[PDB]
Structure formats: structure tokens, C-alpha cells
Amino acid sequence: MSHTILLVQPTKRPEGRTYADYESVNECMEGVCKMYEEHLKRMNPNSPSITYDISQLFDFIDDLADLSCLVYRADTQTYQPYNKDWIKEKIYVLLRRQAQ
Amino acid sequence: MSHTILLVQPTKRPEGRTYADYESVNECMEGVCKMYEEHLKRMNPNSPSITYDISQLFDFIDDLADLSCLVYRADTQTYQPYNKDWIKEKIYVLLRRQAQ
Amino acid sequence: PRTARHAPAVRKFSPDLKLLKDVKISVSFT
Amino acid sequence: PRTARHAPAVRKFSPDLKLLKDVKISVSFT
DSSP: OOOEEEEEEOSSOGGGOEEEEESSHHHHHHHHHHHHHHHHHHHOTTOSOOOOOHHHHHHHHHHSSEEEEEEEETTTTEEEEEOHHHHHHHHHHHHHHHHO | OOOEEEEEEOSSOGGGOEEEEESSHHHHHHHHHHHHHHHHHHHOTTOSOOOOOHHHHHHHHHHSSEEEEEEEETTTTEEEEEOHHHHHHHHHHHHHHHHO | OOOOOOOOOOOOOOOOOOTTTTOOOOOOOO | OOOOOOOOOOOOOOOOOOTTTTOOOOOOOO
């Protein structure tokens, strides 16, 4: 497991920035999904369950002003940066594993 | 100049987190001072100028729930993390240079 | 001997992006 | 030929930590 920091800017205003940290890359990708699912939950408070296509989650990520992460590398004790498109791919891989 | 990301959590609540990025370590340290000085400005709207001892800035930094930074290293294209006490020292060095 | 310090479990932080907050629509009928 | 896109200069972000916001004191006289 590599400690992972997620940097989030939902809109063009930097006043909305936040960050989160996770024990692994996988937990970070699970966290991105949870962030979207919380958005859907507040949009649909009366729905006990929601199904979405991965494309909807990717649309949501695309529409974020900024999303990136930083993955701890033990061999240099530094953080490797990865951008939105890298995150989306790791989410696809995660969800495919989860489905199986 | 090394691109530098600053992670700020003012209180125990993670809902107050923010981050900022800077073109250099020096600009990041200048930014930490500016963050304190803005706090003093809103505390003292009638004061056109405020003088403070460095110890007051360090007290303010100590009282932040979390402060850390990430400094881009071109030789590995990764970010090196540094904690609150490293930041305070780099601020001391910056202000000493500025005074001279 | 120093005292061992216990506290409640820290909840995992999950950001609420508040994307619907203050989103308004105005409709004219003229 | 593609259009060159110009926009206003982006202001440098300087966080307002809002540390005095909603800070209150209650004083009893009894």
C-alpha cells in the first residue's frame, strides 16, 4: 500500500479546494467513487440505491475543475504525481476487479 | 525554482482544508507569511501597517491543525514532503535574507 | 508514568462537494 | 486557423482561513 493524497478543485474558484489522504491507491480510487456517489445521494435523497454507468462517473470527473493525486514511493520517500486521466484509468481497473 | 504545493488544515475539522501551489519554495514561504498577515489584517481592519515578532508567526503556524508542503524534484519528477518544522525554518531563513 | 491517551475513532473524511448548493433557475413568462 | 484564446490574468490564490468567523463569547453576570 502506497499512501496517496488526492487534490480536488470542483469549480474554477480555488476557494472550493480540498484534499484527502488514503492508505493506498485503491482506497483513493474508492474515495473518488464515494465522492461522486455522495453527490448522487444528495441529488436523490429518496433513492435507497442508485445505478450509474462508468461514463457518468467519468463525465463527473471531467467536469471537475481540477483533480490529481500523489502516490508515495518508498524507494525515494517522495510522492509521484498523477493526473485526471491516470485516475480515471485506475478507477476503471478497480471497478472491473470489483465486478468480477 | 521548484514547484511547491502547500497543504493547509487550520482546525481539527477536515472541512476547512485547502491547498495552494507556488512556483518556488521561496514563494511558498512568502505565501505562508501572507496567509498569517491576511489573518492579522482581518483582525485589525483599521491598521494600515502591523509589525509582528517572528515568534507570533510561529505561534500561528503551531496552532494550525496541519501544515505541510511538497517540493518538486526535477531529478525524479516527484514531490518531496516537508513538515511544519521544516517550513518554519525556511521562513526564518527567508525573513533573515529579506531583512538584510 | 505518562498517561495513555484515548479518543474516539476518527471518521474517514469524504468531501461533500456541494455542487447543487445555491444553484438557481429564473424563468420569465413574458 | 485556430483562434488564439485570451482571458483575464488569474489572481494568485491566498487562502482566507476565516479564523475569527463565528467566534463568540458569552458572559454571565449572576
